[PDB]
Each structure stands twice: as structure tokens, then as C-alpha cells.
């Protein structure tokens, strides 16, 4: 079947504070201990596509890998076809293209009279024998920040059956992110996330999205 490109678009809402975290020297500056990854020009928090891809992939390995794999080259053909496999001639690039997600509602918040788009969260640790506290500050992007989300699916050598299964995998992926967190200190309440206004659109070629859109709005 013919070549086409479908764009999965949504707005990622932060349900709890998100921390991904600064490496870029600009964003590494120690004015706070544990900074968050930020877009250098706007100094706003950014959700790197690499984060989304990585997390969604390792989540989906728990479902779709028959055998648990040591290295990502050992992932199932169903994951490799979507995320890519560097050691397999067929899948050297997956069928998915992630995009860095950027803060959408900065203006909404500026209007509401929000000041910073990050909170500084104070935590501590209690020694189990001495009971003394060692305190800790770490940045989060504030909850109810929203980020414009875009993911591209390419239809090339798939049989319509195959694109259907791929769509199943993508919907499982997004739901699994919703029932997990975006990499942070997740166990301790950080990375909760929601996809709002989740929508598919054919941006190239012809494919018909009606039934997919239904299936996305219901899962």
C-alpha cells in the first residue's frame, strides 16, 4: 500500500511536577543543585524527544518482547520496526520520528500571573539509625505546564494489517506513559503525564484516520 505520513499530535499536560534535567552548560549552571533540561533561547522547560522515545520504548519492551532482551539490538521485530535497530538491515531506522516538545501555555500562565515555570522542591533523607536529616533541593517543571507533542508514523513496507498492529503499539505506548511517568524521580511522585486532544492526521499521502482517531479518543 502507498506511502504516507501520519502525525500523532497532542498536548502533554504535567499532572505532577516533572524533572528531566540539565546537562547543557547553559542549563547546567549551579544556581540550583539539580536543574531541569531547558530550551536555551527561552529558558523554558523542554521535553526532549529522546526522553519520550526512550521511555515509551522500554515500557513497550515489557509488553511486546517475547524474551526479555539484554541489548536494544535484541528487541522484537515489532519494536525494532518502530524504534529502529542499528544491527538489522531491515530496520536501521524505525517508522517513528519523535519531536522535542516545547512549552505551549507559557502565555496562558503569564496571563494567570504565574512567575517561574519551575518549582524548587525540598526533600530530605532520614538516617535509619541516627534519625538525622540530610536535605536536598531539586527542580521540577511546574505541574499543569503543557507541551506541544508531535510524533510521525511513516507507512512504507507495511501491509495494512501491519500498520494496524503498529497503531495498537503506539496507543499502548501512550497509555503506558500515562500509567507511568516521564523520566524523573518517578517512584516519589514526579513525572505524571497526560496526552490531551490526542489526534491523528495524515500530513502526507492518503491514509484514512477515522477509525484510528476513534480508537485513540477511547484509550
Size of the residue set binding another protein (CB under 8 A): 52
Distance CA(132)–CA(100), nearest Å, equals: 41
Calpha distance 47→80 (Å, rounded) = 23
Query: Closest approach of Cβ 218 to another protein, in Å?
Result: 26
Q: For the segment 189-218, give every residue that binds another protein (CB under 8 A).
A: 203-204
Beta carbon nearer to another protein, 26 or 214: 26
Longest dimension (CA), the chain: 68
Question: Are 114 and 145 within 8 A, CB to CB?
Answer: no
Nearest one of 195, 208, 87 to 155, comparing CA atoms = 208
Q: Is there binding between residue 81 and another protein (CB under 8 A)?
A: no
Q: Which of 62, 63, 77, 93 binds another protein (CB under 8 A)?
A: 93
The residue within the footprint of another protein, chosen from 1, 152, 194, 209 (CB under 8 A), is 152
Instruction: Give residue for cell 526479555.
Output: 68
| Residue 218: Cβ-neighbour burial (10 angstroms; 0-12, 13-18, 19+) | exposed
Dist CA 26 CA 36 (whole Å): 11
What are residue 194's DSSP bridge partners?
Answer: 13
Window of 31-39, 60-68, 172-180, 189-197 that interacts with another protein by CB under 8 A: 31-39
Residue 186 in contact with another protein, rule: CB under 8 A: no
Residue 31 in the binding site for another protein (CB under 8 A): yes
Could you say whether residue 176 binds another protein (CB under 8 A)?
no
**Is the distance from CB of 120 to CB of 32 less than 8 angstroms?**
yes
At its nearest, how many Å lie between another protein and the CB of residue 78? 17
- Which residues of this chain interact with another protein, rule CB under 8 A? 3, 5, 7, 23-33, 37, 39-41, 48-50, 53-54, 83-84, 87-90, 92-94, 96-100, 102, 112-114, 116, 120, 135, 137, 150, 152, 154, 156-157, 203-204
Amino acid at each position: 500500500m502507498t506511502f504516507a505520513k501520519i502525525k500523532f499530535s497532542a498536548q502533554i499536560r504535567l499532572e505532577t511536577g516533572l524533572h528531566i534535567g540539565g546537562s547543557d552548560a547553559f542549563a547546567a549552571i549551579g544556581a540550583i543543585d539539580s536543574p531541569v533540561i531547558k530550551d536555551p533561547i527561552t529558558n523554558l522547560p523542554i521535553i526532549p524527544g529522546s526522553s519520550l522515545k526512550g521511555k515509551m520504548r522500554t515500557l513497550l519492551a515489557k509488553v511486546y518482547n517475547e524474551k526479555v532482551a539484554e541489548k536494544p539490538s535484541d528487541d522484537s521485530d515489532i519494536l525494532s520496526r518502530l524504534f529502529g535497530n542499528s544491527k538489522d538491515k531491515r530496520f536501521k531506522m524505525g517508522r517513528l520520528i519523535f519531536r522535542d516538545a516545547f512549552l505551549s501555555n507559557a502565555d496562558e500562565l503569564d496571563s494567570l500571573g504565574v512567575r517561574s515555570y519551575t518549582e524548587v522542591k525540598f526533600e530530605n533523607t532520614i538516617d535509619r539509625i541516627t534519625a538525622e536529616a540530610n536535605p536536598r533541593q531539586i527542580e521540577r517543571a511546574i505541574r499543569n505546564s503543557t507541551f506541544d507533542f508531535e510524533l510521525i508514523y511513516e507507512i512504507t513496507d507495511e501491509n495494512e494489517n501491519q500498520v494496524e498492529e503498529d497503531f495498537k503499539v503506539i496507543r499502548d505506548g501512550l497509555k503506558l506513559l500515562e500509567l507511568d511517568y516521564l523520566g524523573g524521580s518517578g517512584s516519589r511522585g514526579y513525572g505524571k503525564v497526560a496526552f490531551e486532544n490526542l489526534k491523528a492526521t495524515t500530513v502526507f499521502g492518503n491514509y484514512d484516520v477515522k477509525t484510528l482517531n476513534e480508537l485513540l479518543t477511547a484509550e
